[PDB]
mmCIF file of C-alpha atoms and ligand atoms in Angstrom:
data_model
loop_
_atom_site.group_PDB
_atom_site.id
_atom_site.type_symbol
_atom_site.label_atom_id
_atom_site.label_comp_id
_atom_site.label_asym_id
_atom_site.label_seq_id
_atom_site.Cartn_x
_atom_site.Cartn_y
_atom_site.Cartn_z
ATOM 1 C CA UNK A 1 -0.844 -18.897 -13.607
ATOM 2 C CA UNK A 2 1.347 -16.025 -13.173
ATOM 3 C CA UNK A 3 4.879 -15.343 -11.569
ATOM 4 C CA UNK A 4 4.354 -11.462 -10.912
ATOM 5 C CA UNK A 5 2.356 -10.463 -14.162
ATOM 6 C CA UNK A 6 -0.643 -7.823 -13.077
ATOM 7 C CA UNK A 7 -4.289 -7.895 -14.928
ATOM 8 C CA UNK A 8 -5.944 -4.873 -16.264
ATOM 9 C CA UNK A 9 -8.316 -4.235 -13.380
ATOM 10 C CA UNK A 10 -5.701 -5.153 -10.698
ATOM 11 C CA UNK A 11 -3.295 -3.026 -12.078
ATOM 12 C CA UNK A 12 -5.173 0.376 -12.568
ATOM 13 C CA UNK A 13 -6.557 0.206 -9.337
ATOM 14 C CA UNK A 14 -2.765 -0.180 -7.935
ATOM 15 C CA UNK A 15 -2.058 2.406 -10.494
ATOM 16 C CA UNK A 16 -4.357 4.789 -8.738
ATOM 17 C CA UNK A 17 -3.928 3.924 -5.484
ATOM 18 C CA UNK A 18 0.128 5.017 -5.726
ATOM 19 C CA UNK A 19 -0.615 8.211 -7.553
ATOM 20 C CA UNK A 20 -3.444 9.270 -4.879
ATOM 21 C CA UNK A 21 -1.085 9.351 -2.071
ATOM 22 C CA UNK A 22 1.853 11.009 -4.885
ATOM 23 C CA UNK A 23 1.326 14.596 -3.627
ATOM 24 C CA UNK A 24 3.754 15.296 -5.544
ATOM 25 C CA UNK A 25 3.728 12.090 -8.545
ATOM 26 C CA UNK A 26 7.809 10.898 -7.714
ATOM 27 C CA UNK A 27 5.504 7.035 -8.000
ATOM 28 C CA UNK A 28 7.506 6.185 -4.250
ATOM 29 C CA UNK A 29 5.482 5.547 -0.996
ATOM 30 C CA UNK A 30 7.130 6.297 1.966
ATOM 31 C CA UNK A 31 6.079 4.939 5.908
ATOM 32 C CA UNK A 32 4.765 8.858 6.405
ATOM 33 C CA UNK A 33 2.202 8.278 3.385
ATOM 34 C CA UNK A 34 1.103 4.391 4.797
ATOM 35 C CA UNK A 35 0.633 5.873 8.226
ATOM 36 C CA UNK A 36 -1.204 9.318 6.874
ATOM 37 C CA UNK A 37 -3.449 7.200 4.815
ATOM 38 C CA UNK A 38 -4.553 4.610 6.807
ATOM 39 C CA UNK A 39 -5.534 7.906 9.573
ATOM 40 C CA UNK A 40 -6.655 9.883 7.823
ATOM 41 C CA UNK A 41 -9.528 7.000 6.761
ATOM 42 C CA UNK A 42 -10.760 7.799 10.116
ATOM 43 C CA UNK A 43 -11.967 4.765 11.628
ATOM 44 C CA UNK A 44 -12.962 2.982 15.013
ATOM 45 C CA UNK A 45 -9.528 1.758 15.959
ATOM 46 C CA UNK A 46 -6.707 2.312 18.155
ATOM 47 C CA UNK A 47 -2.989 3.760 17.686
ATOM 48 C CA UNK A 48 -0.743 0.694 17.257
ATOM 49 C CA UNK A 49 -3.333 -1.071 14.948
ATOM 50 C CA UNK A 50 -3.268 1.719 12.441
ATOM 51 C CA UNK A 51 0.592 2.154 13.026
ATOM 52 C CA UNK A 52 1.239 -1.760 13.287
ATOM 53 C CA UNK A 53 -0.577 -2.130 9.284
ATOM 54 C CA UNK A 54 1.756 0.692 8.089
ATOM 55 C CA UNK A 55 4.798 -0.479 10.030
ATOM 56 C CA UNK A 56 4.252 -4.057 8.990
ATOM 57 C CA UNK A 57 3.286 -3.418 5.131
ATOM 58 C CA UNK A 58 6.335 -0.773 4.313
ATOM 59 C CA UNK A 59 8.707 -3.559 6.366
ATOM 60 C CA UNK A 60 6.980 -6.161 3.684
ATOM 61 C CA UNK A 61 6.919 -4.044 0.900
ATOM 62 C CA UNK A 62 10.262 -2.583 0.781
ATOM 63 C CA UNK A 63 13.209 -4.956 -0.451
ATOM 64 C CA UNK A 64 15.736 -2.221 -1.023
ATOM 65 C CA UNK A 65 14.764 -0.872 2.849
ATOM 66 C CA UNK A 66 15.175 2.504 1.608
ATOM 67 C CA UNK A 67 12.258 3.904 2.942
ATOM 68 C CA UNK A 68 10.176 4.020 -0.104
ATOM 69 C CA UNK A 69 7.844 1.814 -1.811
ATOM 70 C CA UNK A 70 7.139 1.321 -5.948
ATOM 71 C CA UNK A 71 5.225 0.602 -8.053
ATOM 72 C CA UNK A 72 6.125 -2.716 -8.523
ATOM 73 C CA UNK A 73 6.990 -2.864 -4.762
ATOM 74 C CA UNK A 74 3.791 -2.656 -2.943
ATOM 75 C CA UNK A 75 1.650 -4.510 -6.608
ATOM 76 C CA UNK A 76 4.265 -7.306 -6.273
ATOM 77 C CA UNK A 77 3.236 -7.686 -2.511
ATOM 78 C CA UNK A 78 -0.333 -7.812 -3.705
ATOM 79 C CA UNK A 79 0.455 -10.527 -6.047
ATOM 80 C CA UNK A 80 2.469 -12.146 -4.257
ATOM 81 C CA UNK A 81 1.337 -12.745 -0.324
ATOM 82 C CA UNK A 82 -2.099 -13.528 -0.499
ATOM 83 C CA UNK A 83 -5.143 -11.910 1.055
ATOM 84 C CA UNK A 84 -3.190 -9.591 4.377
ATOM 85 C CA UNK A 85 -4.648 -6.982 6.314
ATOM 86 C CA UNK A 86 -2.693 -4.547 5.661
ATOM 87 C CA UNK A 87 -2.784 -5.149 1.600
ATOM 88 C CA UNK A 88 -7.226 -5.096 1.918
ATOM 89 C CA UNK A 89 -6.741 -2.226 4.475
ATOM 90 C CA UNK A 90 -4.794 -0.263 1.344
ATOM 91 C CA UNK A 91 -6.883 -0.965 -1.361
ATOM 92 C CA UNK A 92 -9.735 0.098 0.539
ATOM 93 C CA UNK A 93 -8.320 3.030 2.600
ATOM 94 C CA UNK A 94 -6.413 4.610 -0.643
ATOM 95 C CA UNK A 95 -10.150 3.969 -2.095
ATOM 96 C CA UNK A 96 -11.467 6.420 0.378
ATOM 97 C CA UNK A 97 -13.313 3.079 1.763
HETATM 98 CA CA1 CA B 1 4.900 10.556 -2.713
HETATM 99 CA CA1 CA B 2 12.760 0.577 -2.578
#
């Protein structure tokens, strides 16, 4: 078991997927990078899908509610609420798909 602990595979893919979206490497993810991500995948799907996985993830993956997620933010929500849309949406949109 594991209370918030992150394997080697797990955690450089996170790792990655933070510092794709860092334009500019400050290791925070704000609603404006959730919401340009997940569009810019371009996909079959409506406005309020795209904009209710963004909405929904940064309101579950920011505990401060500052706006911005971390590192350990949005890998503690993958480690910790188990398989979600918007966490699988992500992993795969931040992995180009
Ligand atoms: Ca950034
Ligand atoms: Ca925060």
């Amino acid at each position: 078991m594991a209370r918030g602990s992150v394997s080697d595979e797990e955690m450089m893919e996170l790792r990655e997927a933070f510092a794709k979206v860092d334009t500019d490497g400050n290791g925070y993810i704000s609603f404006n990078e959730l919401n340009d991500l997940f569009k810019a995948a371009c996909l079959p799907l409506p406005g309020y899908r795209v904009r209710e996985i963004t909405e929904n993830l940064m309101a579950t993956g920011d505990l401060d509610q500052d706006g911005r997620i971390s590192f350990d933010e949005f890998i503690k929500i993958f480690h910790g609420l188990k398989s979600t849309d918007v966490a699988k949406t992500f992993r795969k949109a931040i992995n180009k798909k």
